[PDB]
mmCIF file of C-alpha atoms in Angstrom:
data_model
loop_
_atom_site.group_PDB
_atom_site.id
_atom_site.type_symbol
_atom_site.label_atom_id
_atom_site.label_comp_id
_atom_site.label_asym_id
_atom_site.label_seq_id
_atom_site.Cartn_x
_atom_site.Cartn_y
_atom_site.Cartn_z
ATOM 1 C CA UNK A 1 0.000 0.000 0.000
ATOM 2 C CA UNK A 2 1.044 3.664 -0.208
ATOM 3 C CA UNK A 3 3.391 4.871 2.366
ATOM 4 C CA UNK A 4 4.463 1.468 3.384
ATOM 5 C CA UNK A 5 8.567 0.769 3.701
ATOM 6 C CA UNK A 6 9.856 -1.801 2.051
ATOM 7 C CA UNK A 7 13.537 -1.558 2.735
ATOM 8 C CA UNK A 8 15.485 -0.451 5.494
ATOM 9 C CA UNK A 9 19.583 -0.171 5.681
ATOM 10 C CA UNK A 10 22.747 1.469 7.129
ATOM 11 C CA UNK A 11 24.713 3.322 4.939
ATOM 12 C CA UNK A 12 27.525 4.004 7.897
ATOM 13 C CA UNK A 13 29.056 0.692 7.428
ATOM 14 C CA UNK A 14 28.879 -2.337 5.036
ATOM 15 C CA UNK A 15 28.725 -5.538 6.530
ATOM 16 C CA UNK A 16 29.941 -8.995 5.772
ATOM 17 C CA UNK A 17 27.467 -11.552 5.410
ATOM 18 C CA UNK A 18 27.848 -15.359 6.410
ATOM 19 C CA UNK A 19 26.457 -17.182 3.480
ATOM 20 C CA UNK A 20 25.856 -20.774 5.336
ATOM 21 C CA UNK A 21 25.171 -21.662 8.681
ATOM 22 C CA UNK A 22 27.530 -22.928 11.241
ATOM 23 C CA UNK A 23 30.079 -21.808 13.816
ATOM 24 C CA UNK A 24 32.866 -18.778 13.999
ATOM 25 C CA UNK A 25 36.433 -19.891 13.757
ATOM 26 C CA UNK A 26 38.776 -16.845 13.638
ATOM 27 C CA UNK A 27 41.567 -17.384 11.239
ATOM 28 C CA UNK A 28 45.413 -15.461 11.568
ATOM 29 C CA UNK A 29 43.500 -13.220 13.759
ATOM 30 C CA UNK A 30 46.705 -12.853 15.910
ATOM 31 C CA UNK A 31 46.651 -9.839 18.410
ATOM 32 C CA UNK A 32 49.379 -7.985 17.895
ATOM 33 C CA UNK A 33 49.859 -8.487 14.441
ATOM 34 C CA UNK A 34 46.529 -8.472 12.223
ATOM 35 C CA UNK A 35 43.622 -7.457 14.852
ATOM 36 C CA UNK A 36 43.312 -4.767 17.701
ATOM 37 C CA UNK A 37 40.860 -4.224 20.832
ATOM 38 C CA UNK A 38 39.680 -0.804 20.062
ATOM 39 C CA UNK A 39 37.372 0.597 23.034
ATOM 40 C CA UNK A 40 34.899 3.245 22.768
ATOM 41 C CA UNK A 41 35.646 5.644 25.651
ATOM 42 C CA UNK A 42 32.241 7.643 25.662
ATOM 43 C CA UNK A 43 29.871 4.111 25.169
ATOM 44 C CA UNK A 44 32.985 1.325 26.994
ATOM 45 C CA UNK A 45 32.409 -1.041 24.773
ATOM 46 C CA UNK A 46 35.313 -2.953 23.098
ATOM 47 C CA UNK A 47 35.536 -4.245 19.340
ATOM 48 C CA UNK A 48 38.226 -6.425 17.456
ATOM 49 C CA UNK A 49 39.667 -3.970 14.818
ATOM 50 C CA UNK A 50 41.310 -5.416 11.723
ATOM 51 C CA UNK A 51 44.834 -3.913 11.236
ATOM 52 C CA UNK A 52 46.148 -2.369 7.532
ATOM 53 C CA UNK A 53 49.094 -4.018 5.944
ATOM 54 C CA UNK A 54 51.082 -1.241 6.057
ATOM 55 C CA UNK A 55 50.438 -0.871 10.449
ATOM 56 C CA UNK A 56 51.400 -4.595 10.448
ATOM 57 C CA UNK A 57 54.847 -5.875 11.523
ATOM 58 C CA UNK A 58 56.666 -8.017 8.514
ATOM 59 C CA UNK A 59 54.790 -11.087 9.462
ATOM 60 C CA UNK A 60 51.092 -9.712 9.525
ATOM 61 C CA UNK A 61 51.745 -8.623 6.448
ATOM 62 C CA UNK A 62 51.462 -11.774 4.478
ATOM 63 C CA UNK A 63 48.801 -13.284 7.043
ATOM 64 C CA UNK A 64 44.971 -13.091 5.770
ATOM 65 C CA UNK A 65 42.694 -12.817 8.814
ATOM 66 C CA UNK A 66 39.348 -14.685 8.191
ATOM 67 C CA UNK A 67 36.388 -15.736 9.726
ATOM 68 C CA UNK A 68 35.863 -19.841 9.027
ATOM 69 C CA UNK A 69 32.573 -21.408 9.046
ATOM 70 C CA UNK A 70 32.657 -25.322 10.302
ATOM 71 C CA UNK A 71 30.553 -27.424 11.378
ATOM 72 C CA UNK A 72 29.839 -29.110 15.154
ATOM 73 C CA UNK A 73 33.068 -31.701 13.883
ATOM 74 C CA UNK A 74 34.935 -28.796 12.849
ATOM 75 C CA UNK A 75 34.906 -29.411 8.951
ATOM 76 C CA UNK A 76 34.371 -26.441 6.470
ATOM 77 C CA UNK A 77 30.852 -25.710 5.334
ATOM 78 C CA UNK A 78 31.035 -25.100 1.318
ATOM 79 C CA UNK A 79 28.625 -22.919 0.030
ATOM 80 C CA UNK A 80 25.777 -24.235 -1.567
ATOM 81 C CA UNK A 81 26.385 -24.537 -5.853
ATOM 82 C CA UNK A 82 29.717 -22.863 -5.727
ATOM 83 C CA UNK A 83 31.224 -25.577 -3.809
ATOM 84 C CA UNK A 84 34.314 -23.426 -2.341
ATOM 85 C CA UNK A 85 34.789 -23.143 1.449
ATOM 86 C CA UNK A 86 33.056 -20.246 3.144
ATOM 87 C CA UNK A 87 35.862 -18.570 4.670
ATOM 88 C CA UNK A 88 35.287 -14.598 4.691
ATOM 89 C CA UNK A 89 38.667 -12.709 4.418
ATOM 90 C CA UNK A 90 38.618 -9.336 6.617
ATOM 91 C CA UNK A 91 39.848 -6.875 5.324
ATOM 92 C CA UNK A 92 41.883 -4.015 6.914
ATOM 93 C CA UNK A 93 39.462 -1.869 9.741
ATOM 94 C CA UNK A 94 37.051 -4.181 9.739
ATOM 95 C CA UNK A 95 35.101 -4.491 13.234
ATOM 96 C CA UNK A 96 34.532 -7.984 14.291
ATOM 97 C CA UNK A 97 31.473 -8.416 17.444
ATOM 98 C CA UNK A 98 31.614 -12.181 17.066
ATOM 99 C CA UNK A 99 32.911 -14.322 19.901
ATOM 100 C CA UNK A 100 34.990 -17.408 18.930
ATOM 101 C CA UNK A 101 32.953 -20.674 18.281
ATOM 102 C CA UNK A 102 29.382 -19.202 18.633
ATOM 103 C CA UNK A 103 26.488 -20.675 16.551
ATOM 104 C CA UNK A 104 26.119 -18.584 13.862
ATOM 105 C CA UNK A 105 22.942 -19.035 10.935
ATOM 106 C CA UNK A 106 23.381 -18.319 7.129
ATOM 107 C CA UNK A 107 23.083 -14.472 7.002
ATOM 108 C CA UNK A 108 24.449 -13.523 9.785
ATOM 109 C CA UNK A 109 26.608 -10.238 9.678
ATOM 110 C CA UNK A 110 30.198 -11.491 10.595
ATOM 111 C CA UNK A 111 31.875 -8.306 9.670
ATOM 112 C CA UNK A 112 31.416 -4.605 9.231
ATOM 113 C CA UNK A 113 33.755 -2.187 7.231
ATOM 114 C CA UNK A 114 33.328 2.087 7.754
ATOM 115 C CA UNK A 115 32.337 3.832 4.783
ATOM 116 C CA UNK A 116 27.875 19.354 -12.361
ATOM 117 C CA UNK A 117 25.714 20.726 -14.610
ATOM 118 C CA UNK A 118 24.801 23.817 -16.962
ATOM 119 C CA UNK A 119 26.589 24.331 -20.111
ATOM 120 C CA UNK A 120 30.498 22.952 -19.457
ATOM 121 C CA UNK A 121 28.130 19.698 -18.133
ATOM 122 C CA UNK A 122 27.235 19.476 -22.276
ATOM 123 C CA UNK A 123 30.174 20.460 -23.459
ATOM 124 C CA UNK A 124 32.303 17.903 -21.258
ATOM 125 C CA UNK A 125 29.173 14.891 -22.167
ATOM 126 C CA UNK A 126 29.934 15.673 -26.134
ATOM 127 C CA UNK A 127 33.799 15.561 -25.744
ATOM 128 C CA UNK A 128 34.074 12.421 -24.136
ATOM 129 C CA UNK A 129 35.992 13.456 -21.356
ATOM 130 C CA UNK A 130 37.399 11.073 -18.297
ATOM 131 C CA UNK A 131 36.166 12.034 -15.182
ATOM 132 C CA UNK A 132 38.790 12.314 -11.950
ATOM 133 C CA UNK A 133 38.455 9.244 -10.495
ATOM 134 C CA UNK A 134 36.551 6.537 -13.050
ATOM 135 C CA UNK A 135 34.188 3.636 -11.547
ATOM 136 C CA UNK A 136 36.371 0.624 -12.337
ATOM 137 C CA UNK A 137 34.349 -2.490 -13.797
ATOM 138 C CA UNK A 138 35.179 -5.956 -14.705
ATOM 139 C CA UNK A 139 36.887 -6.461 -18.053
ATOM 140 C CA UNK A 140 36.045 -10.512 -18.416
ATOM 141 C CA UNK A 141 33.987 -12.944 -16.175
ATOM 142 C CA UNK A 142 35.018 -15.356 -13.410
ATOM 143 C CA UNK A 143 36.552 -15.959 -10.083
ATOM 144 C CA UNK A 144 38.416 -12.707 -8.882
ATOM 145 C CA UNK A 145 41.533 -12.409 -6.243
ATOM 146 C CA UNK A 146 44.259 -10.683 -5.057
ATOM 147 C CA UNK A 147 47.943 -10.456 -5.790
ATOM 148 C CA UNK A 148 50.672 -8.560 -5.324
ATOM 149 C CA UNK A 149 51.213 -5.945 -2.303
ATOM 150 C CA UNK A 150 52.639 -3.006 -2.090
ATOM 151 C CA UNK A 151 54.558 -3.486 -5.575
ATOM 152 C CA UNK A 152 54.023 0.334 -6.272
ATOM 153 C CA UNK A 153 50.477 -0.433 -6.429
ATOM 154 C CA UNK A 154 48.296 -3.261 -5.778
ATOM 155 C CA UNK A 155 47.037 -6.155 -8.253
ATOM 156 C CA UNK A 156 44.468 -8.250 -9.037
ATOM 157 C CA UNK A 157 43.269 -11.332 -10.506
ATOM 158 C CA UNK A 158 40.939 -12.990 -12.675
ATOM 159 C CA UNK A 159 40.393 -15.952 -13.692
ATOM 160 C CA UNK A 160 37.935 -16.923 -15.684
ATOM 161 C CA UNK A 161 36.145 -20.675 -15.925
ATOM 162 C CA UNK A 162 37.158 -21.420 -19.159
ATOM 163 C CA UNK A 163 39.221 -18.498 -20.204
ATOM 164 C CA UNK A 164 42.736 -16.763 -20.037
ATOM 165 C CA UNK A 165 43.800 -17.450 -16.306
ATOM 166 C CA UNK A 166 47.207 -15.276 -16.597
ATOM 167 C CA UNK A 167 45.183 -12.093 -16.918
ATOM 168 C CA UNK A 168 45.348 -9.406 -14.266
ATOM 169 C CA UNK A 169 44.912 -5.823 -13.725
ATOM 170 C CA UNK A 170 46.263 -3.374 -11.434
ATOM 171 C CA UNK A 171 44.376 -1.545 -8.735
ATOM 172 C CA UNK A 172 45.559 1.344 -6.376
ATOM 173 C CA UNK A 173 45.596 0.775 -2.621
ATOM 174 C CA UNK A 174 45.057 4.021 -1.877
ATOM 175 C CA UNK A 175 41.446 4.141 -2.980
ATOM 176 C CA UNK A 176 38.444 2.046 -1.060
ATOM 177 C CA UNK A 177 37.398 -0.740 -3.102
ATOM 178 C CA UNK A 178 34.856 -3.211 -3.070
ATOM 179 C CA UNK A 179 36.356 -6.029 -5.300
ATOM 180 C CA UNK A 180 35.211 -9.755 -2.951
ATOM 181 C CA UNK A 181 38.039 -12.017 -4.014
ATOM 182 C CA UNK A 182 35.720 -14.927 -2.412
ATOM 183 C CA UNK A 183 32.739 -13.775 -4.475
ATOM 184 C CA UNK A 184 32.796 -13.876 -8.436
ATOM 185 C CA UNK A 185 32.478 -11.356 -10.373
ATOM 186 C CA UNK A 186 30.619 -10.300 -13.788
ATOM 187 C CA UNK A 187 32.160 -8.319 -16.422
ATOM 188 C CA UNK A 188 28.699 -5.984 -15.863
ATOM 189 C CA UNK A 189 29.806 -5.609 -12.556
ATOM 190 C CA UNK A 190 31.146 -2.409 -10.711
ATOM 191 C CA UNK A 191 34.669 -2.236 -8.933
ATOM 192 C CA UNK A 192 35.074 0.839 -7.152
ATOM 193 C CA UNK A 193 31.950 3.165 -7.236
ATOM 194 C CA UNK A 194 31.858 6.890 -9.102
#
């Protein structure tokens, strides 16, 4: 009916969203090294902070913090159809709420990461111009992942089912993307947003 909502969300942060259920089994979360206790001095409470590469030590640099998750026995729950373990990777400052080893159900947020016009308007639109910072898509289909850190600027991966696997593609750190290297990805599919 009129005036009912339909659709409620948070823009603040995105979250990270179990896709089977299950329990939580942290992964290279090592404090110290990947993860932080950050507190909240004006509400007290206290939240597992994922740490960036770069405000790593050398070894939490090549460690992937992840959230596994297993069954009761402790074996790996694939996802449903895609058949490839669900282990979420967390990225750097992502907040993580969940306990270790707590039931958890499929859809569950594990994670949460912080978030012209007139004439020159037509004039730009008819010469074709390249805006500041371009939306970056998928060139080809398939599994997606990373690569390379820090090697002047980052890379990535794709791989294709049946296609070229040694393609890649480079993408600055610098800028806050929202590629899912355990999701695939479309070639009609959006990158970085603008």
């Amino acid at each position: 009916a009129g005036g009912e909502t339909v659709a409620n969300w948070d823009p603040h942060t995105m979250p990270v969203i179990t896709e089977v259920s299950g329990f939580v089994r942290f992964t290279d979360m090592i404090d110290g090294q990947t993860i932080t206790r950050q507190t909240d001095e004006l509400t007290g409470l206290s939240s597992l902070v994922v740490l960036d590469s770069a405000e790593r030590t050398a070894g939490g640099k090549d460690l992937r913090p992840a959230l596994k998750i297993v069954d009761a026995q402790g074996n790996d729950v694939l996802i449903p159809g895609t058949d490839m373990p669900a282990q979420y990777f967390l990225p750097g400052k992502a907040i993580v709420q969940l306990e270790d080893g707590v039931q958890i159900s499929s859809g569950d947020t594990l994670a949460r990461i912080p978030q012209t016009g007139g004439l020159p308007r037509v004039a730009d639109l008819f010469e074709a111009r390249r805006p500041k910072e371009p939306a970056i898509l998928a060139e080809i289909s398939g599994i997606v992942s990373f690569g390379k850190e820090t090697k002047g600027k980052r890379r990535l991966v794709i791989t294709p089912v049946d296609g070229s696997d040694p393609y890649e593609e480079m993408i600055p750190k610098w800028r806050q993307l929202n590629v899912f290297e355990g999701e695939r990805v479309e070639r009609g599919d959006v990158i970085s947003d603008g």
